[PDB]
Scaffold this active site. Structure first.
Site, PDB file in Angstrom:
ATOM      1  N   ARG A 178       0.783  -1.242   0.000  1.00  0.00           N
ATOM      2  CA  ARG A 178       0.000   0.000   0.000  1.00  0.00           C
ATOM      3  C   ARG A 178       0.816   1.295   0.000  1.00  0.00           C
ATOM      4  O   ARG A 178       0.253   2.387   0.164  1.00  0.00           O
ATOM      5  CB  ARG A 178      -0.968   0.035   1.191  1.00  0.00           C
TER       6      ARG A 178
HETATM    7  C1  LIG Z   1      -3.980   4.340  -0.743  1.00  0.00           C
HETATM    8  C2  LIG Z   1      -5.151   3.367  -0.799  1.00  0.00           C
HETATM    9  N1  LIG Z   1      -6.118   3.413   0.320  1.00  0.00           N
HETATM   10  C3  LIG Z   1      -7.234   2.549   0.339  1.00  0.00           C
HETATM   11  C4  LIG Z   1      -7.458   1.602  -0.742  1.00  0.00           C
HETATM   12  C5  LIG Z   1      -8.709   0.640  -0.763  1.00  0.00           C
HETATM   13  O1  LIG Z   1      -8.894  -0.060   0.409  1.00  0.00           O
HETATM   14  P1  LIG Z   1      -8.228  -1.460   0.446  1.00  0.00           P
HETATM   15  O2  LIG Z   1      -6.593  -1.333   0.454  1.00  0.00           O
HETATM   16  O3  LIG Z   1      -8.724  -2.132   1.781  1.00  0.00           O
HETATM   17  O4  LIG Z   1      -8.669  -2.345  -0.846  1.00  0.00           O
HETATM   18  C6  LIG Z   1      -6.501   1.553  -1.829  1.00  0.00           C
HETATM   19  C7  LIG Z   1      -6.901   0.461  -2.930  1.00  0.00           C
HETATM   20  O5  LIG Z   1      -5.946   0.445  -4.003  1.00  0.00           O
HETATM   21  C8  LIG Z   1      -5.353   2.410  -1.893  1.00  0.00           C
HETATM   22  O6  LIG Z   1      -4.471   2.358  -2.928  1.00  0.00           O
END
Ligand SMILES: Cc1ncc(COP(=O)(O)O)c(C=O)c1O
Ligand SMILES: Cc1cc2nc3c(=O)[nH]c(=O)nc-3n(C[C@H](O)[C@H](O)[C@H](O)COP(=O)(O)O)c2cc1C
Ligand SMILES: Cc1cc2nc3c(=O)[nH]c(=O)nc-3n(C[C@H](O)[C@H](O)[C@H](O)COP(=O)(O)O)c2cc1C
Ligand SMILES: Cc1ncc(COP(=O)(O)O)c(C=O)c1O
Lengths: 199, 199
Positions: A178
């Site tokens: 992430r």
């Molecule tokens: C920075 C970021 N936050 C939240 C999310 C979405 O939530 P999750 O990681 O639980 O799929 C993403 C999905 O690519 C993301 O890139």
């Protein structure tokens, strides 16, 4: 793998070019498709996909119907945003700038290049206005497809284009666990200021 | 082939559902990915992709960092636009509405569902702020990956979500000879007013 500051080109367009190129060979659908966001008089944003047709230091160009919503909105607020949704390749490119009309000479040049049928089609649609039936479109089309006979198919007066200036360009590339890579190129003076942004 | 008014469902969500479904099986990359546009205090629009996580008559939901740009922008102007770029399937779905914060109960529920590592990652990034190096992210991550030991990984206080209301929903589907089908569902009173729009 990875997007490090030391690998960044001084001109964001260099990077955009390489990314656009790689998307094309990667066979993405419409690598040139970008989402243009505009704002109406009440502060409400609006979006729609358009195709990038040309780009250089002066900005990015797309063509549209001058009586359309995006057009009325740009007239009241020229601030726009462009986003290239290349997430299948784990990338995003966001451009921020002002939209300025293209001269008739440029518009003219591009119009007399697209498929003859598309030129006829440009005449048919009063883009964005409410129409009572699809048939209206189909009628006008045939009524022109032959009326013009294709003699040259004149440039509609309500057909134009915009060049969005490059005040800011942001690059986003997929990151493990992430932690994505983000770099914001910000036009400042006669140069580009680069900053990494938290994901 | 074709999008005729007589085939439209009374609830735009029915159509959206069918379209979302078909995109998923069509194996599109992130069928749930949508571009959310927001506007800053100077009338300048901004865009970024986020993932749709839930939707119903109340609106569409996505989660984000509450200290991020989109967040500051929504606070000053809750009017937003969502666009699902499904052009590989020759489609577009644009939603217009207001973004409202989700309660901590809802946010809490969803947070303790995503991958443990993503929960740790949510802590690491001060989303959208300028950081001097990628290493900062990588440090914090490991420093938490073990500090939490994964005991449960607490919900960060700066982690939230928004529900965008459905004031308008537009459907766009590829049309031959440049004559695309467009239908705008417009929330009016206790119902939806439908109009076809010129392409
Ligand atoms: C920075 C970021 N936050 C939240 C999310 C979405 O939530 P999750 O990681 O639980 O799929 C993403 C999905 O690519 C993301 O890139
Ligand atoms: C892949 C793709 C490319 C498109 N390219 C353009 C374009 O270059 N110019 C244009 O006016 N509309 C284009 N459209 C249609 C627009 O998204 C939109 O329906 C139209 O411009 C009217 O938007 P408006 O009512 O916000 O003005 C395209 C749609 C898709 C899905
Ligand atoms: C496929 C994909 C999904 C993403 N999903 C989300 C999301 O659900 N929430 C989020 O905060 N950012 C998400 N991002 C990252 C955002 O596009 C953006 O970088 C981030 O939210 C910060 O934007 P902001 O600075 O405009 O606030 C995603 C990016 C991609 C390409
Ligand atoms: C309504 C509309 N106008 C203009 C364009 C782009 O110009 P051209 O048809 O010459 O590719 C498109 C491209 O999909 C379009 O859908």
């Amino acid at each position: 793998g990875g997007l490090r500051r030391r690998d960044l080109p001084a001109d964001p367009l260099t990077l955009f070019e390489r990314w656009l190129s790689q998307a094309c060979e990667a066979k993405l659908a419409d690598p040139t498709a970008m989402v243009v966001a505009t704002v109406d008089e009440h502060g409400q944003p609006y979006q729609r996909i358009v195709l990038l047709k040309h780009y250089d230091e002066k900005g990015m160009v797309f063509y549209t119907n001058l009586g359309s919503r995006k057009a009325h909105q740009i007239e009241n607020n020229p601030r726009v945003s462009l986003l290239f949704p290349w997430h299948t390749l784990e990338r995003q490119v966001m451009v921020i700038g002002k939209a300025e009309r293209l001269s008739t000479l440029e518009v003219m040049k591009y119009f007399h290049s697209r498929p003859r049928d598309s030129q006829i089609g440009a005449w048919v649609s009063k883009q964005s206005s409410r129409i009572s039936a699809r048939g209206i479109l189909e009628s006008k089309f045939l009524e022109l497809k032959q009326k013009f006979q294709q003699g040259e198919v004149p440039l509609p007066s309500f057909w134009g284009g915009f060049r969005v200036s490059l005040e800011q360009i942001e690059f986003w590339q997929g990151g493990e666990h992430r932690l994505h890579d983000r770099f914001l190129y910000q036009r400042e003076n006669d140069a580009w200021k680069i900053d990494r942004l938290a994901p």
